[PDB]
Design an enzyme around this catalytic site. Structure first.
Site: not given
Ligand SMILES: Cc1ncc(Cn2c(=O)c3cc(S(=O)(=O)NC4(C)CC4)ccc3n(CC3CC3)c2=O)s1
Length: 508
Positions: A284, A302-303, A342
């Site tokens: 997270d 995180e949110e 996102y």
């Molecule tokens: C190149 C980048 N580095 C950071 C970035 C920000 N980001 C994320 O950090 C991101 C994290 C997750 S995850 O796996 O951590 N799952 C969650 C959200 C916790 C429930 C899932 C999607 C994310 N997407 C959107 C997607 C890329 C199209 C995003 O844009 S884009």
């Protein structure tokens, strides 16, 4: 054009398969257990321990709304019971959003001109269809009030605050969490509202009033996600447990002297931590105040996790702001929703039926660690040795399980930690996490979220250092040389970190 690189994901350690048999669950000095362990059974709702409500209204415990000490001034000198006022206010039929606003404000009179309810009024009146709004006020809200008002019968044990420097765990039932979260929705927690409060100034907000303010197009999405959770847990009581552990390290490695080699790596620009990182320690990308802006405007990494796994939100009730040497480990939270997008494109998609197996303590096999990266005013600040050492120690603390043997530690499922708004360099943060995972003796599953070039660079760097048998110390000293050669004397860097590393090693 390969979607992943490195060690196949099937070769990486998962859980509870590669996660040791649990010792008997029991309360102890460092472990609060709020249920009857002797009666804990699969598929049965846990029984609260003790049987009858026991109250603690002090500096080391959650101040409960149902406490006899939760009083309000009435007029001369006659102190009234805030809990009785909450009951009276919430046991009314809500037919319009104004009725809900009015009910909440009856026991929050001082905030009647400070709390805005625009998002709540617009969700109910302007977003929801007639039948959806009817279902909300005829079934969801009355079912949320009943579980909120059941609090003294459900949460009978005082909840200790996971204060700074404490190494302490709290195990509670998902049912206890639902009752507590319905209270946070109705903004009933006392002493958690004032902007100038000193008692809980270093604690995150727990009452949901900021979720009801303003006109962001994202508020109905946050509300749909939370009402999905509330509809699920009020219809059928969840039967599992959730553990919250505050971990604080004293002894950090002398990085420059770390003789440990790098561990395995799986790096991909596709997939997510929650879906593709099952049975792995899931990271997270937290704020020092756990949950960040979940109860307000935030909608990043995180949110979103806190919305789809709402049981994580209750960490805000008892978790003090994380210090540099601390992390919060959350085991057992359940995923109730699915989403798309996102930040500004986030949408609630549908209800999720969590398929995770439960361990021997009836906890879903899902371990999430909250580790807060630093916010950098200037880009080059992060290359300062003290700032690099801080990031290493933070990630190491989140990854280390003292006492547990390496063969019993799942891989770490992480990604671009501290990026975007916080100003972190993805190539440096990726290295920092790889080094901390190596020192903690865990393999790394790295998600680059659509950045294919970053996936290739992390993989090429990792394979380069591994083939050359460079230790954690060898890599940390290269980071110290980068600062020294390129960042320290830099007034405006000329050379990027990874080219610098390849050059430094290849010419030595
Ligand atoms: C190149 C980048 N580095 C950071 C970035 C920000 N980001 C994320 O950090 C991101 C994290 C997750 S995850 O796996 O951590 N799952 C969650 C959200 C916790 C429930 C899932 C999607 C994310 N997407 C959107 C997607 C890329 C199209 C995003 O844009 S884009």
């Amino acid at each position: 054009d390969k979607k992943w690189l490195g060690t196949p994901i099937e070769e990486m350690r998962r859980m509870p398969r590669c996660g040791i048999r649990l010792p008997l669950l029991r309360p102890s000095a460092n472990h609060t257990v709020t249920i009857r362990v002797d009666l804990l059974r699969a598929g049965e709702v846990p029984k609260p321990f003790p049987t009858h409500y026991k109250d603690l209204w002090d500096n080391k415990h959650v101040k409960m709304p149902c406490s006899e000490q939760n009083l309000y001034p009435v007029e001369e000198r006659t102190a009234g019971s805030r809990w009785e006022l909450i009951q009276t206010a919430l046991l009314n039929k809500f037919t319009r959003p104004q009725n809900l606003k009015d009910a909440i404000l009856k026991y929050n009179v001082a905030y009647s001109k400070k709390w805005d309810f625009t998002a709540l009024i617009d969700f109910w009146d302007k977003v929801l269809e007639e039948a959806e709004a009817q279902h909300l006020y005829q079934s969801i809200l009355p079912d949320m009030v009943k579980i909120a008002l059941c609090l003294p019968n459900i949460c009978t044990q005082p909840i200790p605050l996971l204060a700074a420097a404490m190494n302490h765990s709290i195990t509670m039932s998902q049912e206890q969490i639902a009752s507590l979260l319905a209270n946070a929705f109705f903004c009933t927690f006392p002493r958690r509202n004032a902007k100038m409060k000193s008692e809980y100034s270093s604690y995150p907000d727990i009452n949901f009033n900021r979720l009801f303010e303003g006109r962001s197009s994202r508020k109905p999405e946050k509300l749909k996600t939370l009402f999905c959770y509330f509809r699920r847990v009020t219809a059928a009581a969840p039967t599992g447990l959730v553990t919250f552990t505050r971990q604080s390290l004293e002894d950090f490695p002398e990085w420059e002297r770390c003789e440990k080699p790098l561990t395995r790596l799986h790096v991909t620009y596709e997939g997510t931590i929650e879906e593709n990182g099952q049975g792995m320690l899931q990271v997270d990308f937290a704020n020092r105040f756990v949950g960040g802006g979940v109860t307000s405007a935030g909608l990043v990494q995180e949110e979103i996790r806190f919305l789809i796994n709402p049981e994580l939100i209750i960490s805000r009730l008892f978790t003090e702001v994380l210090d540099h040497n601390e992390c919060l480990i959350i085991t057992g939270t359940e995923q109730y929703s699915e989403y798309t997008g996102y930040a500004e494109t986030y949408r609630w998609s549908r209800s999720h039926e969590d398929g995770s197996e439960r361990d021997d303590w009836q906890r879903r096999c899902t371990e999430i660690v909250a580790i807060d990266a630093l916010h950098f005013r200037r880009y080059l600040d992060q290359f300062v040795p003290e700032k690099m050492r801080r990031e290493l120690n933070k990630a190491y603390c989140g990854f280390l399980r003292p006492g547990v043997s390496s063969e019993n530690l799942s891989a770490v499922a992480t990604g671009n930690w501290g990026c975007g708004a916080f100003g972190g360099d993805a190539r440096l943060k990726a290295l920092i996490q790889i080094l901390a995972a190596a020192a903690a003796e865990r393999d790394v599953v790295y998600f680059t979220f659509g950045d294919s070039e970053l996936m290739r660079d992390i993989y090429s760097m990792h394979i380069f250092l591994t083939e050359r048998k460079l230790t954690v110390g060898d890599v940390y000293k290269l980071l110290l040389r980068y600062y020294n050669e390129e960042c320290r004397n830099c007034s405006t860097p000329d050379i990027k970190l990874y080219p610098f590393i390849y050059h430094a090693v290849e010419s030595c």
